[PDB]
């Protein structure tokens, strides 16, 4: 039953996947365009790479105290 070619040619597939598929594309568009992707993953925005303390690349350089150090490297 349903061998991958009566699904793609069925209209009930496209009365679902012309609504959920664009609303999921827009959900991915708004995850980044609302800046939330910069906050969840901690990637710096293009105005966040260099604070006034440092003008160089960060260096973690400390194992067990890295959690509060990367807060100081990022500038929070």
């Amino acid at each position: 039953e349903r061998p991958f070619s009566d699904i793609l040619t069925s209209i009930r597939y496209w009365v679902i996947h012309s609504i959920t598929v664009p609303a999921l594309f827009i959900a991915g568009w708004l995850f980044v365009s609302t800046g939330l992707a910069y906050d969840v993953f901690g990637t710096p925005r293009p105005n966040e790479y260099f604070t006034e303390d440092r003008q160089e690349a960060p260096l973690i350089t400390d194992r067990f105290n890295a959690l509060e150090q990367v807060k100081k490297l990022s500038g929070n």
Binding site: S5, D6, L8, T9, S10, I11, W14, P46
Partner: protein
Amino acid sequence: TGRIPLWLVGTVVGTLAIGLLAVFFYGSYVGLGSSL
């Protein structure tokens, strides 16, 4: 089953797959990672 033709699905879905790929080459020359 057969309500829409499979070749018209594969044309249209293939077109905005080539169309989405052209956005990835458009965005490779402008904005982030454009070297300008």
